[PDB]
Amino acid sequence: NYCFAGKTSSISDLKEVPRKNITLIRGLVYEGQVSPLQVAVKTLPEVCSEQDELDFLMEALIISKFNHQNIVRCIGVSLQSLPRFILLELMAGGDLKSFLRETRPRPSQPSSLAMLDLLHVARDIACGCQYLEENHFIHRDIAARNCLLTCPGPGRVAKIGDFGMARDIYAMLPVKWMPPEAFMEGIFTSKTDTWSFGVLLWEIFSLGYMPYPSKSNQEVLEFVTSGGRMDPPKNCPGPVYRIMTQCWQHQPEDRPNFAIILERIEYCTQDPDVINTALPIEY
Ligand SMILES: CN1CCN(c2ccc(C(=O)Nc3n[nH]c4c3C=[N+](C(=O)[C@H](O)c3ccccc3)C4)cc2)CC1
């Protein structure tokens, strides 16, 4: 009962891990060990509806079918014991939005991030999105809060880690990440992830600000459907802002695909005038 890349899978295909092999270590979702493999353990509340149950199963099926370095791996599940577990790659850096906020330059850490760090995050997630696009999977909620980092320090890799919106489709709408045609007609295509990536790019280069500062969801909806776009984040290089504004083309067919976005990110990455730009320091 779940189809991805033209292949079907069901609960039977999930890799069940004996509960006795699984130890919880600490809350982070928990850090856990499988018998020694470090994992994150996502739990289903025992007090939940059968729809929560089906939601949890679908989440497991979706993440287990992906195979890509910028999408969080599923080690397995433990569904035959209660509470039910999904076992996931442990991402010690935590979520991207929190990371940017915590790790932005300050006097105590004046060079905590550089432009190249942000470009590598952008590349990482764009590579994940390209894999989803080429496999015809529409994510529908590409946003910093949904991405995870392998570790806090140098060599960190960013990955897409949450697929709940796609799971649900398979006041809570992520309006600020959605293109005009998703509001109006409720039409989604891979061009809709392109728009959302544009907004994630603004999040990254703003070092974790909420998009459309000062605007509520409905004000954003009217702004965007009237042609309004966000200004550049502070100190954002022109070439990077231009990737964003191309992602935010009104017509879906005018937005770049992720192969092109990756090309432009790689280009920014080799340009000394981009990567030698200092990030703002937060006081
Ligand atoms: C100073 N710091 C830095 C370190 N820190 C953390 C905070 C959170 C985490 C964390 O949740 N790591 C995760 N690893 N794998 C998964 C995780 C969440 N998953 C999920 O499935 C979650 O549902 C999810 C998915 C995407 C984005 C966020 C949450 C799968 C790790 C370190 C605490 C504060």
Tokens of 162: 């949450």
Task: List all residues 6 or more positions away from 99 whose beta carbon is below 8 Å from its beta carbon.
Answer: 93, 149, 152, 208
CATH code of 187's domain: 1.10.510.10
Task: List all residues 6 or more positions away from 103 whose beta carbon is below 8 Å from its beta carbon.
Answer: 109, 112, 113, 152
User: Which residues span the domain enclosing 263?
Assistant: 91-271
Residue bearing the CA closest to ligand 1, atom 28: 95
Ligand 1 binding site (Cβ under 6 Å of any ligand atom): 28-29, 40, 42, 72, 88-92, 94-95, 102, 146, 148, 152, 161-162
Contact 158, 70 (CB under 8 A): yes
Answer yes or no: 141 catalytic.
yes
Q: How far apart are CA 126 and CA 140, in angstroms?
A: 14
Resolution (A): 2.0
Chain center to CA of 35: 29
Q: Is residue 255 part of a domain?
A: yes
- Same domain for 157 and 45, yes or no, is no
- Same domain for 110 and 180, yes or no, is yes
Q: Is residue 266 part of a domain?
A: yes
The amino acid sitting at 193 is D
- Same domain for 75 and 168, yes or no, is no
- Same domain for 63 and 199, yes or no, is no
* Burial letters 269-279, b for 16+ CB under 10 A, else e: bebeebbebeb
Domain boundary residue, one of 90, 113, 130: 90
Q: Which value, in Å, is the radius of gyration of the alpha carbons in the chain?
A: 19
- Same domain for 101 and 241, yes or no, is yes
- Residue 16, strand partner residues: 77
The amino acid sitting at 99 is F
Q: How far apart are CA 147 and CA 70, in angstroms?
A: 10
* Burial letters 44-75, b for 16+ CB under 10 A, else e: beeeeeeeeeebbbbbbbbbbbbebebbbbbb
- Same domain for 99 and 195, yes or no, is yes
- Structural method: X-ray
Q: How far apart are CA 263 and CA 283, in angstroms?
A: 35
- Same domain for 51 and 188, yes or no, is no
- Same domain for 75 and 100, yes or no, is no
Supply φ then ψ for residue 16, to 5 degrees.
-75, 130
- Same domain for 120 and 158, yes or no, is yes
Is 91 labelled a binding residue?
yes
Ligand 1 pocket check: which of 25, 29, 38, 146 to mutate, most ligand atoms within 8 Å of Cβ? Answer: 29
- Same domain for 153 and 243, yes or no, is yes
Domain boundary residue, one of 90, 122, 139: 90
- Same domain for 110 and 82, yes or no, is no
Angle at which helices 258-270 and 238-247 cross, to 10°: 170
Q: How far apart are CA 155 and CA 239, in angstroms?
A: 24
* Listed residue (2, 11, 73, 5) closest to 38, CA to CA: 73
Contact 100, 144 (CB under 8 A): yes
- Same domain for 153 and 64, yes or no, is no
Is 176 labelled a binding residue?
no
Q: Kindly report the CA angle at 177 between 172 and 181, in degrees rounded to 5?
A: 95
CATH code of 48's domain: 3.30.200.20
Q: Is residue 280 part of a domain?
A: no
Residue 112 φ/ψ region, left for φ over 0, alpha for ψ in the -120 to 50 degree band, beta for the rest? alpha
- Residue 158, strand partner residues: 149
How many domains are there within the chain?
2
Q: What is the DSSP string of the chain?
A: -EEETTEEE-GGGS-B--GGGEEEEEE--EEEEE--EEEEEEE--SS--HHHHHHHHHHHHHHHH---TTB--EEEEE-SSSS-EEEEE--TTEEHHHHHHHHS-BTTBTTS--HHHHHHHHHHHHHHHHHHHHTT---S---GGGEEES-SSTT--EEE---HHHHHH---S-GGG--HHHHHT----HHHHHHHHHHHHHHHHTTSPPSSTT--HHHHHHHHHTT--PPPPTT--HHHHHHHHHHT-SSGGGS--HHHHHHHHHHHHH-HHHHTPPPP---
Angle at which helices 258-270 and 190-205 cross, to 10°: 20
Residue 165 φ/ψ region, left for φ over 0, alpha for ψ in the -120 to 50 degree band, beta for the rest? alpha
Q: Which of 13, 52, 117, 141 is catalytic?
A: 141
